[PDB]
Write a structure and sequence with these properties.
Chains B, D: GO terms for molecular function: DNA-binding transcription repressor activity; metal ion binding; transcription cis-regulatory region binding. Four copies of one chain form a homotetramer. By secondary structure, the first copy, chain A, is mainly alpha-helical. Chain A has a single domain, classed as Methane Monooxygenase Hydroxylase, Chain G, domain 1, CATH 1.20.58.1000. Helix content of chain A is about 85%, strand content about 0%. Chain A contains three helices and no strands. Chains in contact: A-B, A-D, B-C, C-D.
Chain lengths: ~90, ~90, ~90, ~90
């Protein structure tokens, strides 16, 4: 890669897919499908969520390190990154 | 069943509503930490649902072992479920 | 497998290995080795810890389900299992 | 450095002592939940150490970017570190 900001619309998309996938898990439960099948689908949803989170974080990181090079305020930018990682982890 | 199933459906509807909430936040260009705080809550909610489903599975396995034995088989089912839950 | 209880001594062993592995991470830090190398070693220690935890849990689960078949007290045994999972997760 | 390195060494010595504590508990046949409560604390401590090491790495990368640029390269180092940290 050379890093590209994920478009707002690209993120909204990924989130719509995650919504549809949760609605799918709900259908599975109503049909009394086996517990391991349901858990497999829940795991996939959680994986999808993590990848969205990770994309949002990458773009944030990019702004922080870019703003540091541009403007030189390393302390502020570190502290911004660390907040975002706190809430991500 | 009718009792417990509906509770899970409900939780899953709430999670769905919460993901819509995260979508709205993104469209409104709200700060990253606020969006991630909401994503963390969704992830927490998903974990608790996963945990409830595992509890019911484990309940069936142990209940069936008490009733009908085949303890080795049931134990091995429990361990396989834990393999995929972690 | 047919399930076998991990011996007390087998567990003490695995824990001694984890101790030695943490002491190894400490040496790496004193020698100012690169951060990704150090984190790779920390991950391995965490993995080793998880596998120990998992073994202790498997043996507990085995006692709970065995005691349920033997004695029939499903409620007590479920609640024992769930406590152990609470502190494991 | 001499300052920060020693703090990490210390944390790692405490983690080592804590794993000995878990070993003693097992030899004394203490209940499973008590042993797992102590293992959870060790795992927590290990996570915090991992997090401190990542913070220092990230600090070097951003600091070097402000001083000397090559922002794309540094960003890619940060993302690679996060790949392995999760």
């Amino acid at each position: 890669h050379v890093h590209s900001q994920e478009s707002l619309q690209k993120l909204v998309n990924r989130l719509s897919r995650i919504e549809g996938h949760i609605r799918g898990v709900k259908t599975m439960v109503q049909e009394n499908r086996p517990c391991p099948e349901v858990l497999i689908q829940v795991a996939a949803v959680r994986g999808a969520l993590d990848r969205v989170a990770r994309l949002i974080l990458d773009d944030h990181m990019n702004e922080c390190i870019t703003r540091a090079a541009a403007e030189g305020n390393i302390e502020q930018e570190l502290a911004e990154l660390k907040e975002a990682l706190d809430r991500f982890l």
